[PDB]
Symmetry: C5
Subunit: 207 residues, 5 copies
């Protein structure tokens, strides 16, 4: 028998927040998916947008696993007691603002899920935002210090209303949201850094 006080106590005795949980030599698989909740500010001249989205993140950590046959197989743990992917938005022009409790969910099998709601300003193409076709703002999010051999980032291609949780009170509306995978190399070093290109096709409303 075991409770939540133990599941956490154990996570503390095993988790290494500062050490990436690289199973064997295989890189840590990190899935990234953004759920656009709102579009607060847009500047058709400076090409900047202020958005609110849930940055759904999922990865795995073996050392945190535990037998949940007689205890819960999931618990909410502060991200501070857990290693977290140093994901970053390459084209963000403001520090990320986390609007929610910074708590992740850990499953008895090492599965970890973190989904904070974030408000952030980005630098992207805002042209055509006031037309029927709308504009497309691409946001590149991927690890900042871990390359392909250490961390890998893949989106979540599937069926889902790109504006399922989008505020109906926004002055904008979402037309389409596609998230593809890609890599980023630099004119210095050979190693590339996997990322996810989230393409946001939105437009201003007009009755």
């Amino acid at each position: 028998a075991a409770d939540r006080a133990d599941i956490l106590y154990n996570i503390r005795q095993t988790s290494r927040p500062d050490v990436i949980p690289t199973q064997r030599d295989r890189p840590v698989a990190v899935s990234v998916s953004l759920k656009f909740i709102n579009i607060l500010e847009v500047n058709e001249i400076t090409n900047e947008v202020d958005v609110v989205f849930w940055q759904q993140t999922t990865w795995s950590d073996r050392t945190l696993a535990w037998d949940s046959s007689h205890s819960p197989d999931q618990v909410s743990v502060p991200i501070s007691s857990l290693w977290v992917p140093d994901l970053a938005a390459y084209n963000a022009i403001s520090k990320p603002e986390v609007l929610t409790p910074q708590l992740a969910r850990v499953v008895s099998d090492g599965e970890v899920l973190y989904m904070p709601s974030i408000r952030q300003r980005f630098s992207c193409d805002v042209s055509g935002v006031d037309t029927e076709s709308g504009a497309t703002c691409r946001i590149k999010i991927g690890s900042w210090t871990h390359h392909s051999r250490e961390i890998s980032v893949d989106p979540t291609t599937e069926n889902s209303d790109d504006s399922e949780y989008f505020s109906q009170y926004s002055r904008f509306e979402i037309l389409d949201v596609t998230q593809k995978k890609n890599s980023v190399t630099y004119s210095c070093c050979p190693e590339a850094y996997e990322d996810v290109e989230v393409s946001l096709n939105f437009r201003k409303k007009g009755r």
Copy 2:
């Protein structure tokens, strides 16, 4: 039998701020209620409001209980010493700005109460704010990671004037406030998250 100093020592020895106090296997019953204090900024064009309010939060944590027959049955404790529910306004567009000292009240029977004054910005229906019927802006508050099996949220029952604490110097006024309970499920997972929907009907003040 003891003093406030002792009471505090035991709490810090038994309390587990990072572990939900799920008595048995049932969810923790958290009550939420919002006492609107002020309505500062409104924008019918962007549908954003800036509101000040007290977030009456109450729940139970039996592990904190102590003998109060001959000792104080109530003490003030830093929330950082107690487990606190991970509530979040769903339509909030700014993190909550706590205006008051982050102190909770704990009773001998383990009942906990925390009522901080908060100033937050929400995204909601502001249309009609300058009309006689006013606008109805709805705010949804509930746990962020704990579903219905772990935390249950319900509004506090207490029929009183909605603008009983509402500043008479605000540019707007409260026509009515109704706090209902609801559940939000996400297309992926069968877990439902309980929340409270506080609908604030307010308008701009006029004259004649």
Copy 3:
């Protein structure tokens, strides 16, 4: 003869920043007095105002007293090492911006003083600020979690220059200040919470 180091060390070893220094079962008599130093942002439309003031607070904790016949009878101690009254401005719409070092003064007889300079925004009656009688903004401050039986606030009694330290460069001027005591209760609970109501009667200085 004890030095300032031995004095602090003794304070640190006996003071409990999270435990109210209650003697017996009598409330801790806290003194609150505001010294308005400046008045900046003002809006008669939104009924808000930016104000800078010294929140001269004082109370006692006899457990910290020491013999100063041949030693310093006062030291500057970091408020984080001491228990400080959890006071808040009920009608404030921004958290207090403490401009000065967060240091208190502990006196050999257990007396404690804390006088931080603060800039904060308030929602009060700003109407008439541009008239001869000016405007009258009232600020309510008091304990946020401790009720009358645990804490009691009483404004310092002494006729002082209401603008003794007020900035001459401010676009405004103070007509008069009245610090009256007051009590507040809620339609939920019996216990009351004492507070101080400071009435700042100020007006905009006329160039003619």
Copy 4:
């Protein structure tokens, strides 16, 4: 011999950040000098200024001294590991914004230097900023909780250009800066607090 690691380690073990290094009974001698870097915002209507300046502070703490014959005679230390004068700008309307690494310099003789670049807003005379005479904003800096007997402040006795490190891109320019020594006293208590009055005579650079 002893490398930097040893010196820095020794300081961290003997530093008493909350106790004033008062040699004997004579107060701690603190020297302050403001080296203006820029004038960003100025409002003659509200008498406010936003400026950037290097607040050079100098004092001694013999306890930190060491033998630097065959070792480093100066090391950089975080001001958090050391005691620091609780200086305040009596007429500031915003808390100081330290823009530079909060590191100090500790010389082997126990001399401590702390020169942080700060941006802060003040409430002073701006009238004339647009004339050939220019405006004369006066800034009072001094200890906030230590009086003459515990802490003394004196401007660095020197004669250097008042615009040496002033930005050439600023819309304004400095006519002259005088750093006079002064003191303050409050109607209640006999103690006096030593300060420094920095008078900044500046004006807007005309279109020529």
Copy 5:
């Protein structure tokens, strides 16, 4: 056996984040380079600019070195677990805002690399921003408390592209960027402080004639 955990563990036991890694007794060589990403607000009247850039910093700390013949030769460590140059922009009017996770890259040969994306506001010459030649904003970055005998800062002047990483959606375009090493002394004290003068020449896009 030595995985990432150990590499980090030992780094925490032999690393003093507040003690500058002065090998022998010579000064620490810090290489500073800026990679401009975007130019936001620009006020020609007040002469101020909001810029975004990656501050590529590189130096060596031997107390961190380790054998990498049969183990990882690189890891990511929080900058708080190690020593970092106290660089500062002398003409900054706002504290640096770090947008990206604050982690450094540590190689087994003691080599340390820190490249944070920073958003900072500066006071410089903005005149001519809306002209063909454009404006030239100079940003001075160097150590704040370590003089030339303790820290030497030299830019990594390598034949690269200046607007290589600059956002294409910015209202401005980079005409040229030059990073010249320099020193700053004061009419009070003998010590000289090394720095890097980064001159950014830019102008508004889409002008006429």
